[PDB]
């Protein structure tokens, strides 16, 4: 029963159980140990907390950065499958001709619509191409449930919030239909601004129309600078110490591994669900 796996990218055939497995980013890498599927090889240069046992393991090798792994080091690995992602639509005709590659349907750059669903779907054909269907299913009920609990949180409250990115002092905003929409869309945060606008720079006329009751601060700079995330005190930027938000206490400094290396993912999202909750949550 060999599978086919008709993805943005082309068509890929499975016949056989995958043994010698590479997998391109982090979202991959944390899906295959949420299956317990092992991985040959992987970038090593930003892994997640979360994944941290496959930093230190010298027996899954390092294949250099996520955004353009190594392909001498891939083709070298000889694996027998690459799982790869819209980060690098432009190595998967050179990938594809090493290993048979499946690509990650999924929309980093705007994910207003489906996000749950196309991770979801993800989950349920590795499940398929590693003989690992029962456990994915139930993982795939755990987010449902993730889901509802996030839902029930959010629902009827009057609070908007904004999602923003720290960037080495600077702070931008990123909306309904940015990378960040899910957060709108499917857990049902209402957002502060509606307008569609790297994001958008705060200014002092944007963060006036849209302030919000609860504010998201994603520390980018922590994961790309192996730092410390900031915390209130590091926050010198007046516009968003003016805020509702700020005033009241309702500013989450997420949890940056699952929110921006990953965000697609079965750990990563249950991560990302309870800091939105965290939002909303009024009493220790
Ligand atoms: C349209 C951009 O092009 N690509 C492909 C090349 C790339 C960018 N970052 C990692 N690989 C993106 O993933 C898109 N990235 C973003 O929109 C983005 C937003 C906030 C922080 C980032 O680091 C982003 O890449
Ligand atoms: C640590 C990040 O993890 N992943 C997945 C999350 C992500 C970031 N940008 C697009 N997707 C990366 O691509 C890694 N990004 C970068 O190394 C990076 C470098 C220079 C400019 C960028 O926009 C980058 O994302
Ligand atoms: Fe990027």
Do not use: C
Not at 44 to 66: R, S, T, W
Not at 115 to 127: E, F, N
Not at 134 to 147: G, H, I, N
Not at 262 to 272: D, E, M, N
Request: charged letters at 25%.
């Amino acid at each position: 029963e060999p599978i086919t796996v008709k993805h943005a990218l082309g068509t890929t055939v499975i016949d056989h159980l995958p043994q010698r497995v590479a997998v391109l980013d982090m979202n991959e890498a944390d899906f295959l140990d949420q299956l317990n599927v092992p991985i040959m090889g992987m970038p090593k240069d930003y892994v997640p907390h979360f994944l941290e046992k496959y930093k230190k393991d010298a027996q899954i090798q390092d294949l250099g950065a996520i955004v353009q792994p190594n392909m001498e080091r891939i083709y070298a690995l000889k694996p027998d499958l690459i799982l790869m992602t819209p980060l690098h639509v432009n190595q998967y005709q050179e990938l594809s001709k090493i290993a048979p590659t499946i690509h990650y349907d999924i929309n980093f750059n705007n994910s207003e619509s489906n996000h749950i669903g196309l991770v979801k779907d993800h989950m349920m054909t590795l499940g398929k191409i590693f003989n690992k269907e029962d456990l994915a299913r139930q993982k795939v009920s755990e987010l449902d449930e993730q889901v509802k609990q996030v839902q029930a949180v959010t629902a009827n409250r009057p609070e908007r919030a904004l999602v923003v990115l720290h960037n080495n002092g600077a702070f931008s905003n990123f909306g309904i239909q940015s990378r960040y929409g899910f957060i709108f869309n499917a857990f049902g945060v209402k957002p502060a601004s509606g307008v569609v606008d790297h994001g958008q720079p705060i200014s002092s006329e944007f963060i006036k129309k849209a302030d919000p009751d609860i504010l998201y601060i994603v520390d980018r700079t922590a994961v790309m600078e192996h730092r410390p995330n900031i915390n209130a005190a590091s926050v010198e930027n007046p516009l968003l110490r003016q805020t509702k938000a700020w005033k009241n206490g309702r500013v989450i400094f997420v949890d940056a591994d699952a929110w921006y290396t990953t965000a697609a993912s079965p750990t990563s999202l249950k991560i990302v669900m309870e800091d939105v909750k965290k939002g909303y949550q009024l009493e220790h």
